Structure formats: structure tokens, C-alpha cells
Amino acid sequence: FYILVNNNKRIGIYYIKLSIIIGILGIVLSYIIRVELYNSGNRIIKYDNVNYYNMVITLHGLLMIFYIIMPGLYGGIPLYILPILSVITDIVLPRINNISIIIVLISYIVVINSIVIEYNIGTGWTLYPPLSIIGTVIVNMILYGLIIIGISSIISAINFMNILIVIDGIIYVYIWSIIITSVLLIISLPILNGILLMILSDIYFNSIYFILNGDVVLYQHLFWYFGHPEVYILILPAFGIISIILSVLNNKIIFGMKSMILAIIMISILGSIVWAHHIYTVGLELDTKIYFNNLTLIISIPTGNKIYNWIILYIGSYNILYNGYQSLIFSIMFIIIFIIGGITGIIISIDIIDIGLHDTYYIVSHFHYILSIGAVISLLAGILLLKDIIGYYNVIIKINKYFGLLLFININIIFTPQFIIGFNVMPRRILEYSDNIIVWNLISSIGSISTILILLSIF
Amino acid sequence: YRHWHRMSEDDWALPLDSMPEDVKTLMATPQTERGFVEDYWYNRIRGEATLLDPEALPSKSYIALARDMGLQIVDEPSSHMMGLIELYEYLRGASFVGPFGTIENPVLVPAVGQERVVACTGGVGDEEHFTLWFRCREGFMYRCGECDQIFMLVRLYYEDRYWTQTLVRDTFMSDGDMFDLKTLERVHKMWNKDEMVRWEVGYWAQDYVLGKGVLPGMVEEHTRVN
Amino acid sequence: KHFFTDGANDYVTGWENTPPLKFPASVMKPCDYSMTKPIPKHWKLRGSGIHGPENTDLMKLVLWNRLKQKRPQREVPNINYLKDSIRLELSVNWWLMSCIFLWGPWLHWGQEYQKVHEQPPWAMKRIDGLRGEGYFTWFLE
Amino acid sequence: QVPDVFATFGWERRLTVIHHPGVMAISKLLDQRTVVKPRATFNQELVEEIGDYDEDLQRKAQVALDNGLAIEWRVLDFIDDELPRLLAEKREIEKAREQVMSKAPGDYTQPVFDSSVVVPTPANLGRNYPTLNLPSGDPTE
Amino acid sequence: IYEGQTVQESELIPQEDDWVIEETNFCLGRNCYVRFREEDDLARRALHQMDSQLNKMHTRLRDGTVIPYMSFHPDEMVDRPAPIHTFSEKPLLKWTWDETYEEAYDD
Amino acid sequence: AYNGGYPFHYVVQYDDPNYDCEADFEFEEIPRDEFGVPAHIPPELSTQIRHTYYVPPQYYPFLKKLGEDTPELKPYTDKLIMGDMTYDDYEEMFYKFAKPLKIYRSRLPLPYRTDEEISQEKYVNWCGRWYSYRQRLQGDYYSRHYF
Amino acid sequence: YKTENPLYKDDEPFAKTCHTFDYTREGTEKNGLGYYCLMGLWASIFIWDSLYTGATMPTGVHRYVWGPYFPTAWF
Amino acid sequence: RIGGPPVFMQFPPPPPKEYLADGTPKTYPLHQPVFDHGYTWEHWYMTNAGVFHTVYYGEFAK
Ligand code: HEA
Ligand code: HEA
Ligand SMILES: CCCCCCCC/C=C/CCCCCCCC(=O)OC[C@H](COP(=O)(O)OCCN)OC(=O)CCCCCCC/C=C/CCCCCCCC
Ligand SMILES: CCCCCCCCCCCCCCCC(=O)OC[C@H](COP(=O)(O)O)OC(=O)CCCCCCCCCCCCCCC
Ligand SMILES: [O-][O-]
Ligand SMILES: [Cu+2]
Ligand SMILES: [K+]
Numbered sequence A: 001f002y003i004l005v006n007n008n009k010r011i012g013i014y015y016i017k018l019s020i021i022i023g024i025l026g027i028v029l030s031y032i033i034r035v036e037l038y039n040s041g042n043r044i045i046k047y048d049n050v051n052y053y054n055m056v057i058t059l060h061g062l063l064m065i066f067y068i069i070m071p072g073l074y075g076g077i078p079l080y081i082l083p084i085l086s087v088i089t090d091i092v093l094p095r096i097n098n099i100s101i102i103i104v105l106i107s108y109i110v111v112i113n114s115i116v117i118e119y120n121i122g123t124g125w126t127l128y129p130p131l132s133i134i135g136t137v138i139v140n141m142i143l144y145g146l147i148i149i150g151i152s153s154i155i156s157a158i159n160f161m162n163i164l165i166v167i168d169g170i171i172y173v174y175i176w177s178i179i180i181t182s183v184l185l186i187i188s189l190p191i192l193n194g195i196l197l198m199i200l201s202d203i204y205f206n207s208i209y210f211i212l213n214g215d216v217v218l219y220q221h222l223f224w225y226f227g228h229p230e231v232y233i234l235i236l237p238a239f240g241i242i243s244i245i246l247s248v249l250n251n252k253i254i255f256g257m258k259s260m261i262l263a264i265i266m267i268s269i270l271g272s273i274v275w276a277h278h279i280y281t282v283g284l285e286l287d288t289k290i291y292f293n294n295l296t297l298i299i300s301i302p303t304g305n306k307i308y309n310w311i312i313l314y315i316g317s318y319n320i321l322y323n324g325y326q327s328l329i330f331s332i333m334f335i336i337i338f339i340i341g342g343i344t345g346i347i348i349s350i351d352i353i354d355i356g357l358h359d360t361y362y363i364v365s366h367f368h369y370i371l372s373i374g375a376v377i378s379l380l381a382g383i384l385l386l387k388d389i390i391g392y393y394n395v396i397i398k399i400n401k402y403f404g405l406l407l408f409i410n411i412n413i414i415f416t417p418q419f420i421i422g423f424n425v426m427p428r429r430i431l432e433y434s435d436n437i438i439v440w441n442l443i444s445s446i447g448s449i450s451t452i453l454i455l456l457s458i459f
Numbered sequence B: 001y002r003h004w005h006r007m008s009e010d011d012w013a014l015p016l017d018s019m020p021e022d023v024k025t026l027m028a029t030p031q032t033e034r035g036f037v038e039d040y041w042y043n044r045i046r047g048e049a050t051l052l053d054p055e056a057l058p059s060k061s062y063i064a065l066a067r068d069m070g071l072q073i074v075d076e077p078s079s080h081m082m083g084l085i086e087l088y089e090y091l092r093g094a095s096f097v098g099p100f101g102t103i104e105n106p107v108l109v110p111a112v113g114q115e116r117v118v119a120c121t122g123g124v125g126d127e128e129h130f131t132l133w134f135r136c137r138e139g140f141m142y143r144c145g146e147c148d149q150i151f152m153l154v155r156l157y158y159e160d161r162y163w164t165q166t167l168v169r170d171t172f173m174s175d176g177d178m179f180d181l182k183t184l185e186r187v188h189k190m191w192n193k194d195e196m197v198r199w200e201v202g203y204w205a206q207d208y209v210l211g212k213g214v215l216p217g218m219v220e221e222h223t224r225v226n
Numbered sequence C: 001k002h003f004f005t006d007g008a009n010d011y012v013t014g015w016e017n018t019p020p021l022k023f024p025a026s027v028m029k030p031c032d033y034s035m036t037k038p039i040p041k042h043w044k045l046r047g048s049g050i051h052g053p054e055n056t057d058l059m060k061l062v063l064w065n066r067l068k069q070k071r072p073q074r075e076v077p078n079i080n081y082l083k084d085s086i087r088l089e090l091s092v093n094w095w096l097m098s099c100i101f102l103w104g105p106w107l108h109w110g111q112e113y114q115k116v117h118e119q120p121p122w123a124m125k126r127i128d129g130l131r132g133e134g135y136f137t138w139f140l141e
Numbered sequence D: 001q002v003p004d005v006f007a008t009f010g011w012e013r014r015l016t017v018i019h020h021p022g023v024m025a026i027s028k029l030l031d032q033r034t035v036v037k038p039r040a041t042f043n044q045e046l047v048e049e050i051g052d053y054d055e056d057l058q059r060k061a062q063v064a065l066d067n068g069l070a071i072e073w074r075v076l077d078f079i080d081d082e083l084p085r086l087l088a089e090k091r092e093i094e095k096a097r098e099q100v101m102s103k104a105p106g107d108y109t110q111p112v113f114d115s116s117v118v119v120p121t122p123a124n125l126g127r128n129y130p131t132l133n134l135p136s137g138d139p140t141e
Numbered sequence E: 001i002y003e004g005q006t007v008q009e010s011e012l013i014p015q016e017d018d019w020v021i022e023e024t025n026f027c028l029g030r031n032c033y034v035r036f037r038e039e040d041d042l043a044r045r046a047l048h049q050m051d052s053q054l055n056k057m058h059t060r061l062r063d064g065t066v067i068p069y070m071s072f073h074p075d076e077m078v079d080r081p082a083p084i085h086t087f088s089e090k091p092l093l094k095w096t097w098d099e100t101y102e103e104a105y106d107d
Numbered sequence F: 001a002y003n004g005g006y007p008f009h010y011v012v013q014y015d016d017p018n019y020d021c022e023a024d025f026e027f028e029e030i031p032r033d034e035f036g037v038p039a040h041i042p043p044e045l046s047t048q049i050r051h052t053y054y055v056p057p058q059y060y061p062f063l064k065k066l067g068e069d070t071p072e073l074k075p076y077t078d079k080l081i082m083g084d085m086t087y088d089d090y091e092e093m094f095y096k097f098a099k100p101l102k103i104y105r106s107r108l109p110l111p112y113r114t115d116e117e118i119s120q121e122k123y124v125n126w127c128g129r130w131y132s133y134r135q136r137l138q139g140d141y142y143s144r145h146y147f
Numbered sequence G: 001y002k003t004e005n006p007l008y009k010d011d012e013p014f015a016k017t018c019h020t021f022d023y024t025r026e027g028t029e030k031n032g033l034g035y036y037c038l039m040g041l042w043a044s045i046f047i048w049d050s051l052y053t054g055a056t057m058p059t060g061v062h063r064y065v066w067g068p069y070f071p072t073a074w075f
Numbered sequence H: 001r002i003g004g005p006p007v008f009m010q011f012p013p014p015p016p017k018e019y020l021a022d023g024t025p026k027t028y029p030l031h032q033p034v035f036d037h038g039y040t041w042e043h044w045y046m047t048n049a050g051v052f053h054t055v056y057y058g059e060f061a062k
């Protein structure tokens, strides 16, 4: 059978397969955005169809976060190796594992169908009210997709937590990475569901939470109380992969295993209490701002310890071993790239700097360097390491120095200029802009078309 | 073992309705040809026939007494096999901890197949290293590349079969003198008389030898409604 | 206790890490050979040496943990255990009694007083001219 | 010389240990619940406590205590009629115990006693006791 | 931290003056994509794949013991590609301690 | 000390030979325990009453033979003959004579190694020690260089 | 013979082995005097705050025999 | 546990081999093409083969 299979390794393959498929839609949307932003004027979207651009950016964000990177790094690699790393025959909950992937596909079909049938409008992937609650039915459909996705995420989290009860070996760092992400999901998702239900109540049940005398800033608190834990639910599995690859390929035992583990635990606790750095410009109280700014800067400490522990893993490794394997290059590239993204995160963490840089393309470049570059490369590196175990073929990736170089160069051509226009300043979530920002926007656009072309050479 | 769930009622005794109805052939079947249920009732009928005959017990040797109850006299061959069986079962849900393996005394890795995945953690204290996993295939004396701990695979294999309690009992136990049905009848009359049955198994067993339904109350005992 | 714990409240399988204290040490003892004296050099390793059923104490622990599941009578626990088994049940029952015979009476008195004096007997009478019962929990005002 | 034997327990999940052939024979003999019977011995303290739950059993238990009888509970319900046999049975068991204990080692001849009064034995396999769980009083009196 | 096994000087003393470090190649060999024969069917190609497993390979030392293919994690211990059912016999993680009991020995 | 003292499995007896706890719905029959104690006598009281096993006297000569052949077993057999063996005494006897299964390393077939290979064991151990010595020293050397 | 009612027997002790459970030195078995002192203070603060509602607004006029630097002038 | 899912089972022998009427062994589909072009380079890379071993992995132009 195909759909009935409960094999945990087969389901892991399904997650990667579906992430690539849905990923095609994600990348296409990204190409639309960059094409439009190539100059000033209308290029591929009419001025009377500006609502489509708002929908393109909204769906891009939602799909890449919840339907591509999360299903790939928390559903794909985890479901394939975690039961093996735990020296257990199979996953604890076989039937739940099957329904989770089916749920993801069904929620994807709902979203894309809503593109085709509903009027196309957008409110960002952060679905801020009151804009989200005064929209058309496409917003209702997107809400159903998120809630359905939430069901799959929570049940998958329950599945991984049960490994503690059955693990027959040692909890390796990677296993710790997934367990903590599962804990972060169990604690953050129920809050998200509540606020999403309130968005529905105002959309569909004549509720009045997001109209005057009701505080719209309330949504942002509950949303981001899940929002930021989400960005670490998306990065922590990547960290777990990086640890395995560096140790295996360099033939070096992980250094400071317990510090790696305790760094992951620390990032989670801290990541659960820093959400309001996304709400700096709303007008929060001075002491609140100072608390959140202080705790946000603390997250660098545990995150920094992991980075340096990775570096010493690559240091001192034997020279005779060939170092041009794509998996090793990607793992090393992750350290180089993640530091850029994190440092810019610390810059935006200072609220006074953030006043200038909120809702600008500097924020875009910041989270792209971590996700669009770092997380993607980590997932690629992990799949590449498991090529023999997974068994896929008909691609030229394993040893392809051209692909790695071209990808690194062109991805930086896209997002490095977006840091510059952040002090120009070019707001986010816009399509038209002043003529004096064309140069940098044009350079980034040339980078986007080039990256897409390099994706064709792998076949 | 800790990994096993709770004893069943059957783990203690079997219902008398599972007794084979052809007792005459049951007591004449060789041990190698008796199934699990047949072997249970052969031992119980024969074992209780000797135990319920007090006047003969003191003159019966332990070798003969053990045979009647179906208990296997132990010897080094069978002890080795049974011990390795119980060690395999224990390791199913228990940790694998023991002395450091050397050429003289390799770490013994029991397996049914020709291979079992094993990890070396090194020695004690500072001599402990990170888990190094390897596939322990039969016929090779493995040496850890890090601590030089010697490993070896032990296979529970005998004559196209793996080692089980049933296999050990069949291979080493020898059938004695054929059970005499006169003993069954004699003991039956001893403890079962005038509507008092103090050997229920021997009342049912004698009834079957008689043809089923012969003894008082046995037709009523065998008449069920569903 | 309600919640199942493998180590302490293991009622699903009834496993116990150590034998009953009633048994003489010559009959059964806890599996602890940490104090074994050094092995003479002329002794040779016959068994595996692996921790498992080859050790007499561990074997007896496994055997007893299975043969203890059938017993002629109950092993009556002492009253301390019995109280702990239903601690929540008894406490909830007493809570119900408190709600009926303590909370009930004074809540009724307050409402009857409120009827005549407009505000409960544990509140400050207002002079602002507003009407109604007002707050009930005066210490949260 | 006593050979060692394998003793196995469990039906589907079987645990094997080494054991004593004589100890296993005794174990199976005590499993013959119809032949080997548990018997109760009382003391004055416990007889008095029985009355708190069954007055009739207290009176019958007192008779057993006064005669120092180890008695089965089913027989105790008929101690009024069985008393002469029970006293005779007590004597015969004591005679047999003495004879076997006093015999020299290696002498395994059967004891000489009157088995017709000892139950359960081939000579006297017992009586078909009627159930006594029948009300005999009229609730309207 | 782990710094290797401890060595006593007595254990570094050779039994001959010509002893040097054994020069055995730990490169398993030259490999590439597993190459299936056209004639082989699905069953016989499965046998071919099972006979090309690097994790079943080892290096035999001068004294007849073999150092196996080893990995930090058990992910490299299953057949490649991963079969449907991998760890039928529970993989055994061997721990070492100094405890002993008398029953294991004989005088 | 498990399951609140309730045995997972226990014997129940009924006075009426044709009684069925599932078919009948009468309210007069009182079940008994394995020792025969009626259910209306509480456990706390019945467990204090001393119950001993009584075997038919024809078994005394057999129980005597067991004691003589195994003197360590004699005290338990004497209790059984004298009607002083409780259930606890039986349990002590049972577990006292249980022995663990024995494994013999001399019966294990060994992986094949030639006599030439067997004479090189000391050499291979010698190489392993020098590899560990060189490893440990290099760790200090490298740590100093890279840090 | 003599017997003990099982309902009034004492709790069995933990087994003495290499792995021994000991709660004697923890002091977590029951609430101590300190806890009841917290309850008493809570009751006291509750009553005081209501009885004397001008305590938080004290008078700055102070005489203080032996001046301000004497110990009884700090309480 | 008697009659439970076996820990280990031996593979049954493979099905009979098929020959063509002329005796030629019957070939089955195989997705390992021999591409046609003039390039014949062979690149070799030392690869991690666990902790203590390596393998000399070769990539062939064809
Ligand atoms: C996985 C993705 C990911 C990751 C890891 C992070 C990590 C961090 N992010 Fe996040 N962030 C996003 C994804 C991510 N972010 C997204 C998607 C948004 C926008 C959402 C939206 O608005 O729609 C966002 C937005 C965002 C903002 C909002 C700016 C604005 O709205 O105007 C801020 C500011 O506080 C912030 C801060 C941080 C910080 C301080 C970290 C830290 O984790 C970084 C820690 C790492 C380092 C610091 C480098 C490594 C450590 C060292 C080298 C040690 C030495 C360094 C120091 C001592 C400083 N992020
Ligand atoms: C992880 C999520 C993710 C990923 C991969 C990307 C990838 C890209 N994004 Fe991203 N983007 C977001 C998440 C992501 N984005 C979010 C959350 C926003 C904000 C939404 C909002 O404003 O509301 C955003 C916004 C955003 C904008 C802002 C539009 C606006 O609001 O004004 C732009 C264009 O400038 C853009 C461009 C790109 C480009 C050019 C790529 C990439 O195409 C760059 C090239 C890289 C690749 C083409 C490889 C990607 C491959 C995969 C993802 C598949 C991996 C699968 C496996 C390995 C199995 N993105
Ligand atoms: C020599 C020493 C003598 C000492 C004598 C002590 C005598 C003490 C007498 C105490 C009497 C207390 C009476 C309380 C009556 C309360 C009646 C009442 O409110 O009933 C209704 C109310 C519910 O009303 P609702 O309409 O639902 O409104 C409230 C919720 N919306 O019902 C209840 O509260 C139910 C509970 C009633 C409890 C009655 C308590 C009676 C106590 C008597 C104690 C006698 C002690 C005698 C001691 C003698 C010592 C020598
Ligand atoms: C998430 C929110 C949770 C709820 C709110 C949390 C509030 C903070 C945490 C409180 C937790 C308490 C749990 C109970 C612990 C307990 O009873 O703990 C009890 C302990 C005593 O322990 P014992 O029971 O062993 O004696 O109490 C103490 O240690 C105090 C003893 C009494 C002291 C009396 C005098 C106190 C004077 C205080 C002056 C303060 C001045 C302040 C000036 C600024
Ligand atoms: O979001 O960081
Ligand atoms: Cu954030
Ligand atoms: K434009």
C-alpha cells in the first residue's frame, strides 16, 4: 500500500517528499515577490490587483514555515532516524504517525484551493487583527489550515515524547533536540489555538474582542507567545542535525555533550519568555521593554556556547579525509551563516535600534539568513548524510562543489542587500517603492532568478 | 521478568476441558510427538498418579520420581543451554552490564540469528568512552578500535532450530517405561469413591479411557449449553 | 496512590525491586553483591559474569515476582496505607461537608441581610446614592 | 544422592530455574487442594473476636479451641456431629506422627493407625456436607 | 573528559627488539554505486545489496581479531537502504563495572 | 506490598456444588477463601488465625525420606509432618532450594583463529597500548596549539 | 499463640542495600513551625491592614528619647 | 513467548530463475544507465567508513 503504511521510515520519506512539493509553491511565490520588486512600477501584478501581492507574501510565509521547513526538519528527518537512534524497533504510536502526514496534506489542499476559489487578499502571515477579521473568506480558510496543522504538530510532539519511555540506549544530543522542540510545542500550541479561536469568533461569531474597548495588542501577545517559540521549534532540530554531521564526518566525539544538551534546554526556557521583542513599537511600558530586551540578549549565551562547541568539532580533523562532500560543506556553511543571522538578531534586539529597523527589510534578511539559508541547508545536509540509508538517487548532489558555491554566493546576493535597504529605509510587505531604492532591490532580484536556475542543475 | 505482564490463570493450571479426550493414545505418545497441551496433561496425569500413591513414594528413586512428574534432571549440556536462554530473555528488557572483555573471556553476546548490533562503552570511570556501535557477526573475535575490548557472538542454535525450553527437554530427556493405565485406574479408585472425587483429573481421565460418559455424573459434566 | 509509577506505585505488573523483609537472608535477600570479596587469582570465570539471572539473588527476585501473584489470602496493609489510598476521597467528602454546613449558613445570612440593608453584612454602606448589592468579597476591593 | 531438576513456571511465557526434586514434589502435592487441606487452630483471643461477625461460629470455634483441634472451616460448621470423630482423628494423627518421627533413619515403613477416622484418606474420603446458607427465620415475628 | 585509555609503562615494553606498529590498511577498498546485474531479479538484487554492506566489513589484525566498522550512533548499523524491520534483536549497549559475584567462578 | 495486598489470583470456594456466581442471583450463599474462611470473617482477623497444611499420614514416611537425604530440608519436612507448616513456611522452603542456571564458557565454540594468529596476541596488545599512549599525548599537544 | 492485628502494625522500613531510600533528613514529611508562622503572619497582616488603615501613612514628627542614634529609636 | 512474532527468521530461497527460450538469461529493468559521451574521467575520494575505517569512493564519467 501507499496511504495505509504505518512504517515510521516510510512516513519520514513522505514528509520530505511533501515538503519539496509544497516547497515548489513556496519558491514560486518568492520568485513573484522578487520579480515585482525588481524596479519601481508594476511588473507582473496590476495596480488594481495589489491584493494578490498581499496574498502572495502571506502564503509564502505561512507555507514555508508550517508546511515546508517544519514538516521537513521536525517531521521528515525525525521520523526516519529517531527510532533508530533510540535503538527501538519502530515509533511508539504507529497509527498516530500515519494520520499526522495525511493531516498535513489535507490542510495544504485546503489552503491552495482557497487561492483558486476565494478572493485573493492578504494580511501577513502574522494575521494581525483588525485587518485579519475584516477580510474575506480566504482568511477563514487559512485559519482552518492552521488549526488543522496544529493538530498534526501536537500529536507528533506526543509521539516523540513517548520515546523517553521506550529508549533502549543513550539519549543523544539530536534526540534531546527533538524532545525539547516537542515540549515547546506542547506548551505553545494550546495558547495559539485559543487566540486563533478568538480570531474566528470575531470573523464568524460576531465577537467584539478586536474592536474598540477590546485591545488588539492582546492578539499580538498571545500570537507571539507562540510565534517566537516557533522560530526555535524550527531551528533546534537543525542544531541537532549539525551536531551529528560534524561528529560523524570528522570522526570526533561531541565535545561538551552535556553543555550542548543544557544549551538546548536553556534556549527553550528563554525562548518561552522573550516573545514581546516582536512588540517593541506598540508602546509597552518602559520596564516591560527593559525586561524583554534584557532576556532577549541572554539567549545569545547558550546559543554562543553551541557555536563554539561545533567549531572545535571541525578543528583538528584528519586532513586525508576528503572535505568536499556536500553534507560537510553545508554543515560548515551553517555555522558561518547562522552567526550572521544571530548577530543581526542581537542588533534588532536593542529596542532603540529596533524602532528604526522594525517592519523593514533588515528584519527580512535577518530571518532569511537563519531559515531560508541556515535551516534549508541544515535539512539538505541531514538528508545528504542519510543518502545511503534513505536510498534515493537520480540526483547529482552528494559531491557537487558547483552547487554549494553557486547557492552560497547567490543566496547572499539576495539577502545581504536587504540589510542595506533596512537603513534606506524600505518598509516590508510593500510592492511599490521610491526610485532611489531600485539598485539594491534590483541586485537582490538578480540573485533570486539565479538561485532558481541552480536548483535545476541537481537533476 | 520485569518486562513480562501479569501471570494468566493458565500460567498456573489448565482447565480440565482442555484435557485430550483420547487419553489412551495420549499416554502412549512419545515426548517428541506431544504438543504443548498434550505434554501438559501427560505430565499432570502421570505426575499426580505417582504423587497420589503415598505407599510407593518412599521406594521410588529421585530419578524415577522426577521422570513421573516430568522434571528434567539437569546436566552441564542442558544447564548451559537453559542458562543462555534465560540470559537472552533477561536482556530483552534489561541493561547489559558486566566485566571488561578480554581474549580469555570475551563479552558474550547471545543471539538467535547470525548478527546482533552491539555498542562498546569502554571500561569503568575515565576508561569509559562514547558508544561505538558495531555489527557482531558470528565467527569473528571482535576488538574495539578504541579500548581493545574483545567481543564474541554466541548463537542459540541446535540442529536447524534455536534454543527453547521445549527443545532442551526434547533433546536431553529420555522417555522411560510406558505409562501403565492400570496405575491410573488403581489411583482413581483410591481417591474417588461413592460420589466423592478427590482426584478430579483422574476421574476425567478414567472416564475418557472408558469412552467418555461412563462414570457417574460425567455425562452431565460434559453437557454444555453454548 | 492513583498515578502509576514504575518504581513505587507499580500496580500494573506488581514488580518489586527487593524481596519481602519477612524472608530470612538465607532464604531470600536483596540483590546486592557490591561487597563481594576479591576473587582469588586461581579461580577461573565459568559463567558470563554478566549481570542477570546467573546471580542467585536476581533469579530469586524474578521467580518471586511471578509466583507472588497467587496467594491464599490478602496481605492486610496497615491503617496508614489505607488512609493514604483514599486521602483525596476523604478530603473531598469533608470539603463537601464544609460547603454545606459552613459556607451555606453564612452565605444565607448575608443574602437575608442584603435584602433589608441593600448591601451584605461585611460591606461598607455607601452614601453615593447608587443602588444595588455591590461587591461581595470585601477584601478584594 | 539427590539430583537437581529444572522447574519451569508459566504457560506462554516460561521461566526456568533449578530446584530440588523433593521440594517440587511437595509443592505439587500441596496443590492437590482436595487431598492436602489447610486447617485452622484458634486461641481464646481470636475466638472472642469471631463473635463480632458470626455468633454461631464463635460457639463452634470455642468447642474446637476447648479440645485443641486443628479443624477445617467446613467441618467446623458440623462440629456438633463430627466431634467424636474429630477427637478420634486427633489421636490417630498424633500416634502416626510419633511413630514416624521415632523410627530410625532409613526406616520408611508406613505408620500403624486407624485411617477410617482420618479425612481425607482412602479409607474415609469424607462426607457430602449440605450447604448451611439457608434462612430459617420468619422476618415477621 | 575522555583522553583515551590509561597506559602503564610495563604495558609498553616489547617482547622483541624488532616490534614496530603494525601497518594494516584500514581503507576497506574502492567502492562506487552498487552495480546490479540485469539478469538478477528483485529477490536476487536484494541479496546483492545485502552483500555490499560496509558496516558488515572489518579489518583482521595480526592475531586474528578483527576491528569492525564502528559508528558513534546506531543509525549506521542498519542495512543500507534501511529495511522495513531493522532491530528485531534488541541492540545491546554493553556497560562495564568492577562488580562480580562468586557464582560466576569455579575453583 | 503490591496491589494493596490483594493477590492478583486467588482461590474461592462455594458450599453448594451447583452454584454459579454468574447465572444465579440469590442472596444467601457466602463464598470462602482458599483456607476455607467464610467471606464474612474479615481478612484482618482471618490472617491472624494460624492455618497449617495437613497431609494424609500415609505421606509421613515419604516426607521423612526427604529430610534424611537432604538434612537442610529436614526442619521444613518435620514441620509438615507435625502439622506446623504454614504458607509462609512453605514459601521459605521453596525459595531456599532454588538455584540459578549455570553457563559454561568451555562449551562455547570460538571464532576461528590459526595457531600463528594466536601467538601474536601479545604483539597486538602492545600495539594497542602504544596507540593509546600516542593518542593521549596528542590530545594535550593539539589542545595547546588550537586554543 | 499470640498475634498482632495487621491494621495496627507499623510501616515496613526501606530495604538497606547499595540503593537505599532515606527521607529522614529531608524534613519535607510535614509542614513545620515556620509554615504555621507564615500563616499566623498572614492572618496578622490581614487583620492589621484593616484595623489600622492609617499605618501606611505615618507621622514624620519624632521625639525619640536618647536621640535618633539609640537602638530603641529604630523600632 | 511461545507463538509470538519471531525474533529471527531465515529468508526463503529466491524464486526460480527465468531463461529465454534460447537459453539467454532473462533480464529485468535496471535504472543504471551507461550514458554515451566521450568523457572517461574517474574521480576518487577518501570517505568516512565509520570511526576507524575509510573507503576510496570513485565517480566514473560514464
Ligand atoms: C529560526 C529562525 C530564527 C532564529 C534563530 C531567530 C533568532 C533570534 N531572533 Fe529572530 N526572528 C525570526 C526568526 C528567527 N530569529 C523571524 C522569522 C522574525 C520576524 C517575524 C515577523 O516579524 O514576522 C524574527 C524577528 C526578530 C525580531 C523582530 C525585529 C522587528 O520586529 O523589528 C527580533 C528582535 O528582537 C529578533 C531577535 C532574535 C534574537 C535576538 C535571536 C537569537 O536567537 C540569535 C542568537 C544567536 C547569536 C547571538 C549568534 C550566535 C551566538 C554567538 C556568536 C555568541 C556571541 C554573540 C553575542 C555575545 C551577542 N528576531
Ligand atoms: C523558512 C521559510 C522561508 C523560506 C525558505 C523563504 C525563502 C525565500 N524567501 Fe521568504 N519569507 C518567509 C519565509 C521564508 N522565505 C517569511 C516567513 C516571510 C515574511 C512573510 C510576510 O511578510 O508576511 C518571508 C518574506 C519574504 C519576502 C518579503 C515579501 C514582503 O513581505 O514584502 C521576500 C522577498 O523579498 C522573500 C523572499 C524569499 C526568497 C527569494 C527565498 C528563497 O527562494 C531563497 C532561495 C532558496 C531556495 C530557493 C531554497 C529553498 C528550498 C526549500 C525551502 C525546500 C527545502 C526542502 C528540503 C530540503 C527537503 N521572503
Ligand atoms: C452548653 C453548651 C451549649 C452550646 C450550644 C451551641 C448551639 C449552636 C447552634 C448553632 C446553630 C446554627 C444554625 C444555622 C442555620 C442555618 C440555616 C440556613 O441558612 O439554612 C439555609 C442554608 C442554605 O440556604 P440557601 O437558601 O440555599 O442560601 C444560601 C446559599 N445561597 O442551608 C444550610 O446552610 C444547610 C446547613 C444548615 C446547618 C445547620 C447547623 C446547625 C448547628 C447546630 C449545632 C448545635 C450544637 C449544640 C452543642 C451543645 C453542647 C452541649
Ligand atoms: C506562579 C505564581 C505562584 C503563586 C504565587 C507565588 C508567590 C511567591 C512564592 C510563594 C511560595 C510559598 C510556598 C509555601 C512555602 C512555605 O510555606 O514554606 C514554609 C517555610 C517554613 O518551612 P517549614 O514548614 O519546614 O517550617 O516558611 C518559611 O521559611 C518562613 C517561616 C515564617 C517566617 C515568618 C516571618 C516572615 C517575615 C517576612 C517579611 C517580608 C518582608 C518583605 C519586604 C519587602
Ligand atoms: O523571532 O526571533
Ligand atoms: Cu522572536
Ligand atoms: K514594483
Ligand SMILES: [Zn+2]
Residues within 6 Å of the ligand: B120, B121, B122, B123, B129, B132, B144, B145, B146, B147, B148, B149
Ligand atoms: Zn571500546
